[PDB]
Amino acid sequence: DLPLDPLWEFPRDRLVLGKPLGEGGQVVRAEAFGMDPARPDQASTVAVKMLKDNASDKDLADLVSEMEVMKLIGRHKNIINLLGVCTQEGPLYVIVECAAKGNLREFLRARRPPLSFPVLVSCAYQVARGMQYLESRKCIHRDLAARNVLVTEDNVMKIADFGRLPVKWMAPEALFDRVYTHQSDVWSFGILLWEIFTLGGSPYPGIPVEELFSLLREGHRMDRPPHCPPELYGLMRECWHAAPSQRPTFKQLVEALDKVLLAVSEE
Numbered sequence: 001d002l003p004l005d006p007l008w009e010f011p012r013d014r015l016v017l018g019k020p021l022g023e024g025g026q027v028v029r030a031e032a033f034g035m036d037p038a039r040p041d042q043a044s045t046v047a048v049k050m051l052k053d054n055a056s057d058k059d060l061a062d063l064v065s066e067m068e069v070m071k072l073i074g075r076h077k078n079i080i081n082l083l084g085v086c087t088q089e090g091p092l093y094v095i096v097e098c099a100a101k102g103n104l105r106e107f108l109r110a111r112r113p114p115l116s117f118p119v120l121v122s123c124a125y126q127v128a129r130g131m132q133y134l135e136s137r138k139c140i141h142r143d144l145a146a147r148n149v150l151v152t153e154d155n156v157m158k159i160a161d162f163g164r165l166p167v168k169w170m171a172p173e174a175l176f177d178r179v180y181t182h183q184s185d186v187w188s189f190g191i192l193l194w195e196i197f198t199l200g201g202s203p204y205p206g207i208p209v210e211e212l213f214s215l216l217r218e219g220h221r222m223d224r225p226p227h228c229p230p231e232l233y234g235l236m237r238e239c240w241h242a243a244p245s246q247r248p249t250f251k252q253l254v255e256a257l258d259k260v261l262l263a264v265s266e267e
């Protein structure tokens with residue numbers, strides 16, 4: 001049910017629990033000692049996922065699979081990584097990376113002038129690098145949005161939760177046919193780009209969720225954000241082609257976003 005993995009077991013006594021981060025299921029802040037095994041007396045701030053006491057056997061099974069998928073996926077710079085686990089003599093602890101600036105939507109909204117272009121292209125670019133990595137590990141996100149992208153102290157984008165309804169982010173085949181593909185996450189990426197370039201704006205402003213599918217079927221897409229360059233808008237529109245095979249891949253999006261990054265950095 002919960003065996004001992006030598007590659008992942010962390011001593012629970014080297015984990016000092018703190019304030020809750022989210023959920024009501026729970027994510028709690030903690031200070032971990034020795035997350036870097038070379039310097040074991042060195043502390044780091046970590047995020048600890050655990051269940052609430054009112055949780056079921058099914059909730060445990062789900063938390064276990066999330067931990068098991070995380071081990072499989074392997075480490076990447078732009079994903080929230082698994083640091084360790086506490087499985088014996090107590091509650092299951094799934095220890096993950098902590099991102100001090102919270103989610104991307106919140107990061108962008110708190111810095112709206114009453115943050116520069118290299119910073120926005122760098123958010124977008126990193127999310128693409130992270131999504132390209134997940135895709136190579138055969139991982140379909142299903143809910144890519146700015147709120148599921150976390151920001152660290154060093155402005156590092158880290159995609160979370162990879163292992164009413166968000167209608168406004170879902171690719172047509174996902175909303176209607178309930179089919180989730182890598183190409184459908186590219187659609188969600190197009191919406192994520194728009195969220196970035198509007199500094200955390202709400203997709204399809206003024207349009208109610210119910211009137212959305214008809215507008216999409218008529219071939220209507222969001223207009224270009226107020227001061228967004230057409231290269232980036234062209235990418236958004238490409239992400240929103242009705243036909244999945246006509247949308248870019250995460251490889252093309254990384255190549256295209258890298259070019260914008262050098263263009264914004266060179267002069």
Ligand SMILES: *c1ccc([N+](=O)[O-])c(Nc2ncc(C(F)(F)F)cc2Cl)n1
Nearest residue numbers: 021027047080096097098099100102160
């Ligand atoms: C570290 C320090 C502070 C905060 N915070 O104030 O939100 C966080 N946030 C945080 N990190 C990681 C996760 C996740 F990996 F569990 F999703 C969630 C949150 Cl809220 N980290």
